[model samples]
Target chain A: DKIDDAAKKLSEASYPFLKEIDWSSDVYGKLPTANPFQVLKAVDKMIVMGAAMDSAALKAGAEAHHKAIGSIDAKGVTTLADYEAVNAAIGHMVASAGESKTMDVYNAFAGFNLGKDVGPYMMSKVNAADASAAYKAFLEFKDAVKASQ
Target chain B: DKIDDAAKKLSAASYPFLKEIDWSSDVYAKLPTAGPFDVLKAIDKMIVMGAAMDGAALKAGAEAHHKALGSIDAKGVTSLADYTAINAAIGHMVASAGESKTMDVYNAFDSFSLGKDVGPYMMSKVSANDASKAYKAFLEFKDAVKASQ
Candidate 1:
C-alpha cells in the first residue's frame, strides 16, 4: 500500500533526525512499538481543532470574528479536549449550570475564526453555558479530594 | 533542607505523573552535553538588533500565531522546542526593525493577562537584558525565512 511505502520513507527520514535527538534524557520519547491509535488520537484532536478555526475564521471574515463567528462556521463535532475545557469552564461559571457566554465562546472558538478578536466575548459565552456543569463537577471533584485530604 | 524537602516531594509525586505525559527531551541544553553557550548566544543575538524579525513585519502580529498560542500567559522554560517556536515569533517581529505596528501588538501580547499580566512584565523588566549577537542571528533567520517566502 502507498501508506506503508510512505510510512517507510518517513521512518527512514526520521532515523537520521532522531539519531541527533537524544531520547535518553527524555522519559517519554517515542516508543518503537507505541500504539499508533493513541498517538494519532492526540494529533487528530489537534487537527480537528486547528482546521475548524481555519475554516471558520476565513468564512466569517475579519470584521465578523471581531464581533463573533459568522453564521456559516462549521460545528461538525467537538474535539475531546475542547469538550472538556469548555465544559469544565462553563460548569464553574453558573451555580448549577454553565455560563451562556462560555458556550458561545466555545461555539465561536470551535466553529469560526472571524470574530476571533473578540475571544473574550466568546469565552464569556462559554462561561454561561457550563458554569453549572463545572460547578457540579468541581464540587464533586473537590469534595472527593478533600475527603481523601 | 526545607528547599530540599520541597524539591524532593515535588519530584516524588510528579515523576509518575510526568511519566504519563509525553515529554519532549530537548529540555536539557548541554548541561551534561556539549556547551550550550553557543545556543545561548544564538538566543541573545536573536533577540538583539531586533534581528529576529528582520524581514518579517514587526506589525503583522501574524493573526495565525497570536490566536493559536491561546493564553500567552504561561511561558514555561521547561522545553527546548517550545522555546524555539515562541522565540521564532519574537524573531519574526524583531526583523521588522521597529517598523511594524505589529511589534506594538506583540509587545502587548507579551503582557496580555488583565490579571496576571503586570506581574510577569514587572519581573521581566527586572532581570531582562538585551539579547546578544548570537540571539540576533536566530531572529535574523526568522526574518530571512519570512521575507524569502
Candidate 2:
C-alpha cells in the first residue's frame, strides 16, 4: 500500500538491505552465459552472508549468480541481444512480484547508473512516457498491496 | 521612482529609529500638536546629535504612536495602515533622491521582517492575492533593478 510504501517494501520483503545494496556487484567482463535472475540472487546472497546468516540456499544462490553473470570484473551480456535478454529475464521474474518487490528490482536497475553506463543506457531506453506509465503502475500496485494487506 | 518602494519611510527619508523617538523634544512636539512627519524629524535630529540627543524625543514618539494606534499589542489593521502610511510618506520624500539613497529605504522595510514583529503582523493580514501581487511586483522591481544596472 502507499500507506507506508517505502516501509512496507522493506518490512514485507526479506530484502532489507535495499538502501545500501550495490547492484553492479559482478556485471562486467566475459560471460559464457548470463541470466539476470541469477544476478539478482547473487546480489541478495551477498547481503544475506554479510548479515552472517546461516543459509545454504542464499550461499548457493550467490554462486549460481556468479556462474551466469560472470566474475566480479566480467559480465554475461556480450551483445545487445544478451543485454535485452537479461533485462527480459528480470522483467519476467519481477512481473509476478508485488509492488515493493517490483520496486526493489527497479531500484537495482536504477542504481547501476553510478558504476557503469547504466544511466545513459536506461535513459535511451525509457522516455517520459515510460516514466509516466511506471508511476501509474506503481499507484495501482500500491492499491493492490493495500487490499491484500 | 519605484526605487524606495522597499524602504521604511523614516529610515529612507532620513528618519531613523521612529519607534523610540522622543517626540516631546523642543524640536517640534511643544508646538502644541505633531504628526508622524513631525515625529520623524525629531528622530533624525537625535541621529545627527550623537550623545547630545535627548532620549525624551524617542520616548515621546513611542507615546505618540501608542496614543494613535491604541494598545500596541492589539495592532494589525491599524499597524498595517500606519506602516503603509509611513512607507507612502517615505516614497514622496525619496521620490527625487538618487538610486542608492532610495535603495537604503527599501532595504530597511525589507529588513523589518527579518528584525521584528512587522513580518508576523504583515503575514497575518495578507491573503493569497496580496502575496502574489507583492511577489510579482518584487520580481518586476528586481528585473528593473537588474536591467538598469
Candidate 3:
C-alpha cells in the first residue's frame, strides 16, 4: 500500500538519526500536541543552519572529494562505485563536522549534549555568520516549542 | 562563506518540515552517535522521499496555487505577497499531509504516535507510489538503525 511504502522510504532515509532514540518511550513528550508537523520542520531548519555553520568543512570536503573522484559529470560511464564514492565523501565531511562547536550547539539543542545545559550554552563558541544564525534559530526553536507546551 | 550562504538558502527552503520536533529532549538519541552527518543526510532523503510520496497532493496544490497566482515565472515584477503565496501553498500541502496515515507512521516511529503501538501498526491506509516507496524506506531505516545498535 501507499502508506507502507512511504513509511519504508522515510525509515531508510532517517535510519542514521532515528535509530538513536528509544522509541518505546514518549521521547518527544507533549510536543506533538501543539503540532506534529512542526517537529520535522524544526529539524529541517536545524540541519540547514547546521550545514551553514559547518560550511567550511563541507566546502573542504567537497573540494577533496572532487579532487579524488574527478568530475562525476565528465564521466560517460558511471557505476555504483561512483555513487558510493559520493556518499563516502559526504560521510567523511559530515563526520568531521560532527566534532565542531556548531555541532555541539546542535547536539545541545537536540538533547544529545547531556554534559552541557541547553539554556546557558554560549553563542560565542559559534563564530561563523551562518552558524551564529543557526544557533539563534536553535534558541528560537527551543523557546517556541517550550512556549507551545 | 559561500557554503554558509548556500546553507542558509537551503535552510530557508526546508523550514516547513524541520520545525516539527522537540529538540530539547534526546529526541534523536544515539542515532547521531553512529554517524552525526548521517542524521541530516537521512532527513534530506526523507523530505525528498516524503515529497514524492505526496506528489499527487503537491501537484494538485501547485496547480491550485498557480491558478490563483498566475505565472510567477512570467512575472516582470513581484512582491512579498507573491513569495508568501508560494509559501502558503507549500504550507497547506505539508499541513494537510500531516493528518494522513503516512504521517501517522512518521509520528509512530519518531515516538510521536503514542496512541498506537509502532511495531504492529497497519500499512493498509497508504495508496500512492511515492508514499509507498517512502514507507518502505521508513522500514529500512528502522531496521538499519536497529541493526547498528
Query: Fraction of true contacts kept, per model?
Result: 0.00, 0.00, 0.00
TM-score of 1: 0.24
Best by DockQ: 3
Give the best candidate by TM-score: 1
Better of 1 and 2 by DockQ: 1
- Model 2 gets an lDDT of 0.35
Q: Which stretches of model 3 miss by more than 4 angstroms?
A: A1-21, A29-47, A50-104, A107-113, A116-149, B1-149
Candidate 1 residue lDDT tens string, B13-89: 33333223333333222322222332332333323333224323332333334333342222212233233343445
Candidate 2 lDDT, B1-149, residue by residue in tens: 34345433322332222322332222221222333333333433322222121233222333333333432232112344354444443333333233554454455345334335534444444453554455555455444343333
| Model 1, runs deviating above 4 Å | A1-48, A56-62, A67-149, B1-78, B85-126, B130-142
Candidate 2 lDDT, tens digit per residue, A1-149? 23334323322231222212233333222121323333433344333222222123223323333233332222212233233233233222233333454455456555444325544444344364544444454455445344543
lDDT of 1 by residue, A4-118 (tens): 2332333333333222322233223333233433333344344333333322222222222222211212332223333333323222222122234223435543543434543
lDDT, residue A116, candidate 1: 53
- Those runs of model 2 whose alpha carbons end farther than 4 Å from true positions after fitting are A1-149, B1-95, B107-116, B142-149
Q: What is the DockQ of candidate 2?
A: 0.00
TM-score to native of every candidate shown: 0.24, 0.19, 0.22
Ranking by TM-score: 1, 3, 2
